[PDB]
Curated annotation (Swiss-Prot), chains A, C:
Protein name: NAC domain-containing protein 19
Domain notes: The NAC domain includes a DNA-binding domain and a dimerization domain.
Described purpose of this protein according to its UniProt entry: Transcription factors that bind specifically to the 5'-CATGTG-3' motif.
Induction trigger: Induced by drought, high salinity and abscisic acid (ABA). Slightly up-regulated by jasmonic acid. Not induced by cold treatment.
Distribution of this protein across tissues and organs: Expressed in stems, flowers, cauline leaves and rosettes.
Residues of the full protein shown: 8 to 163 of 317
Subcellular location: Nucleus
Domain NAC stretches: 7-139
Quaternary structure annotation from Swiss-Prot or TrEMBL: Dimer. Interacts with RHA2A, RHA2B or RHG1A, but not with RHA3A or RHA3B.
Length: 140, 141, 140, 135
DNA sequence: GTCTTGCGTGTTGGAACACGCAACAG
DNA sequence: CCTGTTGCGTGTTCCAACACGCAAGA
């Protein structure tokens, strides 16, 4: 799924906080070729994250997915705990998205043990198909 | 100038230290050719850093170039580039192939020059005692 | 409070990272003359640091105090932000203390502006009278 | 000396408060910085000669009228001799040196340092030396 | 003098570790 | 209700590239 694009060495997918909101998250409901076809669809909360790399269409130390919009939602042998401060993403002065940090703890809150597996969950600002886009990676 | 590879949206150039040395410096170095000139030949030491972006074929905040190899604080334009840190080594599969040495542009006459936010990362090939170095260029903050 | 000791010119107070822990911080709970009597007691976090020199018993470009053991603790028109790496102090192989760096920013985190006023906060390693000893000086 | 107190005289003090007190040939209450011929010696024998000093010892030595041989080595000058001022008047230069062992320039470097403070003059004569070992 | 690589420690601001305000259930 | 239980932000300190600039020899 990589060299359908025929990429030269050194090139990587380094999307902005801004691109992810506008070009990916927003465009999927609309049906875009490169958008329908370039990122794997999955319910992230059914699995332990260390299973995910083999199920991701690509990635070397980071992976991206679309997952159903929703607390300490259970996944595998653990739970996701919000960390840091949600940040607002703007393009040309409009709020289009929110970047949210999470940390995976194994076990059951608040008796869980922290792990190094991390998520960044990006969402659009809007009232009541409807997905969030998530980045996964491993610390240190 | 990139647009002969129908760029996917979102894609940017973040080659590893290991790739630049080997996939770039060597491809050019065995003197083998590239499909396209992506990293252009230039004499970087004839120039002001602020004129350089105009010379890069692409790059938004970084531009990379190849420049002819020296056979220290080489004067270039209005300044001098000052070396920094400990030159660091690039390895591939347990073999050493290159050193990236960082520099900063000072304007003026050494050592009475003044510091800038301009950085160079210069990648070079290893050898025993058609000769190029590879330079990453960018401006801080 | 200086020439009770009758000092010859050229002499200054240049305590080691090690002396401050052992001879000063540790000895005060014990009631030592030169220790009760040589360093001013103050709650550092009620004041802006540029007020402190007149309230310090001595110092020319540096000042030292004992202050109550405790985040972005407000002081005056600002906040103290941890900087660098906490360092461990040992004497003859025992950890007796920690040296901690801080920088004063004016305003309210994380919208503060950095100033050149600096602190080194030294503390003993022990569960929960109980003070930290702090050095103050000015960059540049 | 009370506990905690150590000798960290400024560049400006050493020149004036020390070198001059001795230099107008005026006396001191106590000899704190002793007279010695430093260039007769190995740096590692020197601490034994300092009347105090834990990591630094300072001494006074008779004055020259370059890489002066001393003991098993030679001292090599470094940096740009730096100037000491007091109240906008220049009074002295501190020049740093390092001890090399052997025969110049085939000698070998050490961790031994000298800072030599000296008095200014026009075209009973001493220099003042700070001694210490690095790292 | 002139002009350098090669080590040192400041300054930054990034993002994770652990405490309670705020809410759902029991 | 009025508490018991089950999540979620938000202010700290950590951890670390990156070079800054004396300073040394080249």
């Amino acid at each position: 799924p990589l060299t359908q694009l025929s990429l030269p060495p050194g090139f990587r997918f380094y999307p902005t906080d801004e691109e992810l909101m506008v070009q990916y998250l927003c465009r999927k409901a609309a049906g875009y070729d490169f958008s329908l076809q370039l990122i794997a669809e999955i319910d992230l909360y059914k699995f332990d994250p260390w299973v995910l790399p083999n199920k991701a269409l690509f990635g070397e130390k980071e992976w991206y997915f679309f997952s159903p919009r929703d607390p300490n939602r259970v996944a595998g042998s653990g739970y996701w705990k919000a960390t840091g401060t949600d940040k607002i993403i703007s393009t040309e002065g409009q709020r289009v998205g929110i970047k949210k940090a999470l940390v995976f703890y194994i076990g059951k809150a608040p008796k869980g043990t922290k792990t190094n597996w991390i998520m960044h969950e990006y969402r659009l600002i809007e009232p009541s198909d409807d997905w969030v886009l998530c980045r996964i990676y491993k610390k240190q």
